Design a protein around this ligand. Structure first.
Ligand SMILES: *[C@@H]1O[C@H](CO)[C@@H](O[C@@H]2O[C@H](CO)[C@@H](O)[C@H](O)[C@H]2NC(C)=O)[C@H](O)[C@H]1NC(C)=O
Ligand SMILES: *[C@@H]1O[C@H](CO)[C@@H](O)[C@H](O)[C@H]1NC(C)=O
Ligand SMILES: *[C@@H]1O[C@H](CO)[C@@H](O)[C@H](O)[C@H]1NC(C)=O
Ligand SMILES: *[C@@H]1O[C@H](CO)[C@@H](O)[C@H](O)[C@H]1NC(C)=O
Ligand SMILES: *[C@@H]1O[C@H](CO)[C@@H](O)[C@H](O)[C@H]1NC(C)=O
Ligand SMILES: *[C@@H]1O[C@H](CO)[C@@H](O)[C@H](O)[C@H]1NC(C)=O
Ligand SMILES: *[C@@H]1O[C@H](CO)[C@@H](O)[C@H](O)[C@H]1NC(C)=O
Ligand SMILES: *[C@@H]1O[C@H](CO)[C@@H](O)[C@H](O)[C@H]1NC(C)=O
Lengths: 174, 318, 318, 174, 318, 174
C-alpha cells in the first residue's frame, strides 16, 4: 500500500491473532510465541471510532412535504419539483460514494502506517543487535530467551546489554 | 533467534470500494445506507392527531367526518388516504396551498362571525349528502342561505366579519352552483345573482352558474370553496343576493406542527423524527434508500443499495 | 560498484492542480470535462418522431401541419422551432403543463366522443386560416358549431363524453371569441351565451366575449383552448348555446418518452442518451461545458473549460 | 514529497527509461546498465486505471426538460428554475474542482510511495553488503557482475553469498 | 555527542476537526466561515437608484410617491420596506412576477400611448387619495375615464396602442370596482359594463363589479391593475364602455440591473458584490453564516458559526 | 501519525523554536545549541499557503432574489423555495465540514512528512558515523565541534573524514 507493509513486504496477515490488530511472533531455543501489541492496535482502533462518530453525527434541518401523496400536483410545478429532487439525489449519491471511497482509502492506508510505525520502533530498539530479513522479521544475533523477547515487545529492551555478543556474531570476527 | 512483526487477517473478508479499487477486500466494514424502515407511525413523545377519514380541509368547513377535529392542539398531524373533505360535492380553489398551510400548523381555534339574517332568508339549508345523526344536515361552519319564500328573490344582504384578534384568521365561504335553472329560481329567485367579497387587501366576485353535470353523492349541483386570510384589525364584507354559503365560524391556525401522509398504523411506544408514506425511519446512518419523499429530520435519500465503510485494514489471508 | 534507483521523466510534461499547488507538472494527464458535442440528433436504437413544423399541442386539436402526427407510438419526441399549434388565432390555458405532458409520453391514441348535433346546428364550421387540400378546413379533432340558419339563436344543447376506458383521457375544447356583435349575432343569435363544462371532478364556465383586436392569419376572432383529464368511469358534460368549439375526438397519452426541443438534424447512425438544443453529447467524461440545459442521461454541467486529471507522477526532467 | 523520494532525495527523473515508470541504473567493471522494474510500475499503473474507471462509471438518471427553448416561461417560476439550476451548477463545478485536486494530490503521493517501496525493497535485499548514497544509489561493497545486478533487480540476490567479502571491504580490513 | 531533530510547539494551541478526530490540536488555524457583515449598502462603483418610499410597481403606474422615479438608468435598484405602490386602493394581478421583472432591469423609458377620447368622456378623473401639489390628482401614467355628464351612459370607445419600436413594451391598465350601484351609475351610466383587451398575443375581458368593502386611504372603491408585454410591430386594442383606467404612457424595461431589498443605509465609499436585507458582505472566505437570502455574487451560506482550517502541524506541547 | 515522527517517536515539540517549524538541537563538549531548518520549513509553509489560495478563489455566479423580503409569497411556491434552499444549504454545510476535515488531516500528515524527510536526510548524511537513538537523535561516534554540527545542518558534512575513527568507536576496539 502507501506504506509498503500490509500487502507489501509482509507476505500475509495472521488469522491466528484474534488478540489485536498488530503483534509479534518469535522463534528462539525455547520455542515460539505470539503476542498482540496494544498501543499500535488502539491507535488504529481509535481513528476508526472517530470516523464512525463523524459519520453518524446528525445535521438536520426538518423538512415539510412539497409532494402530496394522496392528491394531485399541478403538472408544471410537479416536474420542477421532480427535476430538483433528482438533481439533489444525484448530488447526495455522488457525495456518499466519494465519502466512502476516500475514507476507505484512508482507513486501509493508516492501518498500513500503524503497522510500519511498530516495525520502525522495533528496528530502533534493537539497533546494532539485529538485522532485517526483508519479510518483517528481525534476525537477532544473540540469545534471546522468552523474557528477552518480552522486553522487546514491552519496549524495555536495553541494547547495550547485548551489544558486545551481538556485534561478535554479526562480524563473525573479534 | 528471530522476532517477526505482523497483523491480523480473517478467512471471511468483506468487499469495499476505494479511490483506486472497486473490489478491495478488508477485515471488517459497516453499512452507511439504511435499507430498513419501521412499518408504523412512531408517535412516542409527540402530541399527535390522527385525522382518520377526516381530510384537513374538512376541519375548516365542518364536514361530518371531521366533527371530532373541528378544533385542537397538536405537534404532529396525520392525514390518511381517501379522507373526506366534501359531503356535498364541490371543490376548493387553491386547495394544495390551503392543505399545506394546515399541515404545518400546531392547532386550530374556531371563532364566530356572528352573522345574522332576515326572516325572508332561511339560514338552515340542509342536504342528504351531509348526514349528521340520521338526519339531513350541512357543514358545521357554513350556512346554506336560501329564500324562505320558494321562488322569491333572495334579498340583497351584507355581512361583515371583523377580526378583533392580534393574529390573522382563515375564513372560508362557498358558492352554490345549481344544476338547473328551475332549482336556481326556486332557491334564490329569477334575479341576476352576484356575490362580492371585499376586505382591505382582498377583493373578488362570484356568480352562481347553472349547468348540467353528473351526480356525485346523488347531487348534480356543486359547491365551490374559496378562502383568505383576514389580518388583525381588518374587516371583510360579504355583499350577496343568493348562492353564498356563509361562514358561521372562522378558523385560526396556532403555531407549527409536522404534517404526515401515511396509511401506516400508529405506534405510541417507539420514537421517531423521520417519516414517509410507509412509516418511520430510525437510524444513526447518514443515508437511506427507502424513499425520496420523507418529512421531518431525515437521512439523505441515496440511489444505492449499499455503501460499505471499511472498519479494518486490508484482508491478506493465509 | 553501485546500483541506483530511479523513476522516469518526459520532455512534454503537463500541468495539473492539486490541493496545495495550482501549477504541478506531471508526466501524463487526461481531461474530465467534455467540450465537444455532436451537432446532430443521434437517434440510433430509438423509435423517434420528428414533429417538424408540427407543434405538440397541434397533435391534440389536429392542426393541418400535424396531420401526420395525430396518432402514434414513440420513445422519443422531437419538437422544432416555430412549430405551428394554432392555424386559427388563439391560445391555450395552461399550455406549458399540457405541452410537458405530451413531451414525456410514449404515444397518443385518439378516441371518438360520439358527439352528434341537430339540424339547426351547422357542425361543419370552416375557416381560411386552416387550409387543408386547397380548401377551407378546421382542426381535425374539433368542430366549429354554428347556427345553420344565419342570425338565429343557437339551440340549448347538451353533449356528454363517457370515459369507459381503464385509463384517464385528455379532452380539449375551444371557446370562440368573435371580433364583433354582428359576427356574434350572425353565428349564435342575440341571446346571452354561456358554456358550462362539468364532470365529477371538474366544473368551469365560459362566456364568448366580443372584442376588437388585430388580425392574425386574417382573423380578428379568437379561439381560446381549454382542457382536463377525464378519469375512467367518469362522464363529462358540455352544456352550451353557441360559442363552443367541440371535441370530436379525445386523446390518450400512452406510456413514457423523452422530449427533445432541438433544431439539430437527425442522424440514425450515431447513438446517444444526452441531448440539448444543439444536438447530442456522447461522453464517458463525468462533466461537460456545452449547455446547462440538457435532457436524457447527461454529464453534469460545470462552469469550467478544462479539468485535468493527473495520470502520471511528478515530472522532474533532465 | 509526502514520501521523500520523487522530487525529493532523488535529484531527477530519467527520460531514457521508456521501459517503465521505475527502474535501475547500475555500474560495474562491465560498465553501465539500465532496466525498468515491472512489479512497481504495474502497481502504480493499475492504481491510475482504477481512478479512471471510477471517474468514468456513469449514473443512470434521466432528466426531463423544465425550460422551454421555443416558448415563454412564466416569469416567477422561470426565476426559480434559474436560481435552482445555477445553484446546482455551482455545487457541481465545486465538486469537480475538489475531486480533481484531491485525486491529483493522491496520484502524485502514491507514485512517490511506489518509488520509496522499491528503494526500501532493494535496501533490505543487500542488508550488510551495501551502503546508502543519500541520492537513491547503493554503493555495493563487493564485485557485482551483470548477473549479480540482475539477481538484485529480479529479487534473487543472496546476501550471505557475498557477505564476507563485503564486510571486509566496509570495515576496511584484509 | 548527539544531534537531535525536532519540531516547534506553542503554549496556546487551536482546536480543529479532522476525519478521525473532532478535537485535534494544531499550532495555528484560520476561519473559513464569514460571520461579520457590513450593515450598509456598499454602492461604490455602481449607478444605483434608491427608491425610498416608492414601490417598484408605482414606477410604472406613476404613484405620487414615485414622481422622481418614473424613468431613469441604473445597474442596481434598491427597494425599501413599506414602499408605496397604490394611492387609490387596489391590487395588481401577477404582481410578484411584475416586481421581479423591474428589479432585474437597468432602467425605464416611458412612451405615450396617444389615446384620445370623445366629447362624452371626462378623461381627467381625479381623487383625494392621490394628492399632488395640494390638489386632487391621479396616477401619472393612467387616466381615470368617467362620463362627462353624471349619470349618463359612457360611450362605447376604442383605443389602440401601436408598438412601432424594436423592443417589447410593458403596458398597464386598471379596472375600477365601485363600492356602490349608486357610484357606478353616476360614473358610467346604467348600462352593462365591459372591458375587452386584445393584441396579437393577448386577449382578456374585465367587468367592473359593485361591492361593499372597508375604506382604504379614505376610499372603499378599488382599482385592479393588469399588464402584458406588447411585442414590437404589434398593436393592442382597448374596447370599453366604462371602468377602464386607461394608460397614457407605457414602459420599456432597459438592460440588466441588480435588485436589492434592504433597509440598510447607502455607503458610496465602499465596494461590494454581495448584498442582503442587512447590508453587504465582503470576504475572501468561501462560506458565510449571515443569511440564506442574498443577492449578487456571494459566499455560500452554511449552518455553522465556525469551521477552522488548520495552518500548522499537530501541537504537542511541553 | 501517518509518518510516525510528530506525535510519534518524537516525544514532544520544542516551544523555544520560534525561528522555524523544524530544527536541530545538539550537544557536544562545547555545550549545547539550537537552530531551525529553512528548507524543510518552507516546504511545509508553501504547501499550506497553497491550500489557503485555493480556499480564497471565487466563483463569478450572480444570483437574483426569488423571495420577496417585503411582500407575501404565494404559499405553495414558498414551500418549494423553502425546501430547495434548505436542501442546498445542507449540501453546502456538509461540503464545508468535509472540506475542512479532509484538509486538516492532510495538513497534519504532510507536516509529519516533512519532519520525517529531514530526519531521513540527516540519517543518510552521517551514514556509518552515527547511530539512531530511537527518539529523533543521532549518537555521533566521533568528536563533533560546532563547526562540524554546522556542517550537518548545512548538508556539507563529509562522512569519509571521520569514518575510520567512528567505526573503531562503534565496534569498541582501539
Ligand atoms: C496518458 O493517459 C491516457 C489516459 O489517462 C492514456 O490514454 C488511454 O490509453 C488506453 C490504452 O492504454 C486507452 O484504452 C484509453 O482509451 C486512453 N484514454 C484516453 C482518454 O485517451 C495514454 O495512453 C497515456 N499516455 C502515455 C504516453 O502513457
Ligand atoms: C414526478 O415523479 C413521480 C415519480 O417518478 C411521477 O410519478 C410523477 O408523475 C412525476 N410528476 C410529473 C409532473 O411528471
Ligand atoms: C371594522 O369595523 C369596525 C366597526 O364599524 C370599525 O370600527 C373598524 O374601523 C373597521 N376596521 C376597518 C379596518 O375598517
Ligand atoms: C507527449 O506528452 C503527452 C502528454 O502531455 C503525451 O500524451 C504524448 O503521447 C507525448 N508524445 C511524445 C511523442 O512523447
Ligand atoms: C356515466 O354514465 C353512464 C351511463 O349514462 C353510467 O352508467 C355511469 O355510472 C356514469 N358515471 C358517472 C361517474 O357518472
Ligand atoms: C433565466 O435564465 C435565462 C438564461 O440566462 C434567461 O435567458 C432568462 O430570461 C431567465 N429568466 C428569468 C425569469 O430571469
Ligand atoms: C397595427 O396597426 C396599423 C395601422 O392600423 C397596421 O398598419 C398594422 O399592420 C397593425 N399591426 C398589426 C400587427 O396588426
Ligand atoms: C419559508 O421559510 C421562512 C423561514 O423560516 C418562513 O418564515 C416562511 O413562513 C416559510 N414559508 C412557507 C410557505 O412555509
Amino acid at each position: 500500500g502507501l506504506f509498503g507493509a500490509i500487502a507489501g513486504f509482509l507476505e500475509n496477515g495472521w488469522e491466528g491473532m484474534v488478540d489485536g490488530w498488530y503483534g509479534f511472533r518469535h522463534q528462539n531455543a525455547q520455542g515460539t510465541g505470539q503476542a498482540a501489541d496494544y498501543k499500535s492496535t488502539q491507535a488504529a482502533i481509535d481513528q476508526i471510532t472517530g470516523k464512525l462518530n463523524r459519520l453518524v453525527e446528525k445535521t438536520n434541518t426538518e423538512f415539510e412535504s412539497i409532494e402530496s401523496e394522496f392528491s394531485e400536483i399541478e403538472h408544471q410545478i410537479g416536474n420542477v419539483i421532480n427535476w430538483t429532487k433528482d438533481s439533489i439525489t444525484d448530488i447526495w449519491t455522488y457525495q456518499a460514494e466519494l465519502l466512502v471511497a476516500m475514507e476507505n482509502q484512508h482507513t486501509i492506508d493508516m492501518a498500513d502506517s500503524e503497522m510500519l510505525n511498530l516495525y520502525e520502533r522495533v528496528r530502533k530498539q534493537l539497533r546494532q543487535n539485529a538485522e532485517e530479513d526483508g519479510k518483517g522479521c528481525f534476525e537477532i544475533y544473540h540469545a534471546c530467551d522468552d523474557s528477552c523477547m518480552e522486553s522487546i515487545r514491552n519496549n524495555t529492551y536495553d541494547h547495550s546489554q547485548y551489544r558486545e555478543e551481538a556485534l561478535l556474531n554479526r562480524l563473525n570476527i573479534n | 533467534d528471530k522476532i517477526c512483526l505482523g497483523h491480523h487477517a480473517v478467512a471471511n473478508g468483506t468487499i469495499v470500494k476505494t479511490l483506486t479499487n472497486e473490489q478491495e477486500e478488508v477485515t471488517n466494514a459497516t453499512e452507511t445506507v439504511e435499507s430498513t424502515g419501521i412499518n408504523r407511525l412512531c408517535m412516542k413523545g409527540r402530541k399527535h392527531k390522527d385525522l382518520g377519514n377526516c381530510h384537513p380541509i374538512g376541519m375548516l368547513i365542518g364536514t361530518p367526518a371531521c366533527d371530532l377535529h373541528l378544533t385542537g392542539m397538536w405537534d404532529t398531524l396525520i392525514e390518511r388516504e381517501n379522507a373526506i373533505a366534501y359531503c356535498y360535492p364541490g371543490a376548493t380553489v387553491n386547495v394544495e396551498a390551503l392543505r399545506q398551510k394546515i399541515m404545518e400548523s400546531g392547532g386550530i381555534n374556531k371563532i364566530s362571525t356572528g352573522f345574522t339574517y332576515g326572516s325572508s332568508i332561511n339560514s338552515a339549508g340542509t342536504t342528504r349528502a351531509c348526514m349528521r345523526n340520521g338526519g339531513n344536515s350541512f357543514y358545521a361552519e357554513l350556512k346554506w342561505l336560501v329564500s324562505k319564500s320558494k321562488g322569491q328573490n333572495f334579498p340583497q344582504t351584507t355581512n361583515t366579519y371583523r377580526n378583533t384578534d392580534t393574529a390573522e384568521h382563515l375564513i372560508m365561504w362557498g358558492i352554490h352552483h345549481p344544476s338547473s335553472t328551475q332549482e336556481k329560481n326556486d332557491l334564490y329567485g329569477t334575479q341576476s345573482i352576484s356575490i362580492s367579497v371585499g376586505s382591505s387587501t382582498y377583493r373578488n366576485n362570484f356568480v352562481p352558474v347553472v349547468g348540467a353535470r353528473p351526480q356525485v353523492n346523488g347531487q348534480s349541483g356543486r359547491i365551490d370553496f374559496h378562502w383568505t386570510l383576514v389580518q388583525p384589525g381588518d374587516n371583510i364584507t360579504f355583499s350577496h343576493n343568493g348562492g353564498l354559503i356563509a361562514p358561521s365560524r372562522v378558523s385560526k391556525l396556532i403555531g407549527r406542527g409536522l404534517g404526515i401522509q401515511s396509511d401506516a398504523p400508529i405506534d405510541n411506544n417507539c420514537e421517531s423524527k423521520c417519516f414517509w408514506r410507509g412509516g418511520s425511519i430510525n437510524t444513526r446512518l447518514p443515508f437511506q434508500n427507502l424513499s425520496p419523499r420523507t418529512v421531518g429530520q431525515c437521512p439523505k435519500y441515496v440511489n444505492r443499495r449499499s455503501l460499505m465503510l471499511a472498519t479494518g485494514m486490508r484482508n491478506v489471508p493465509e
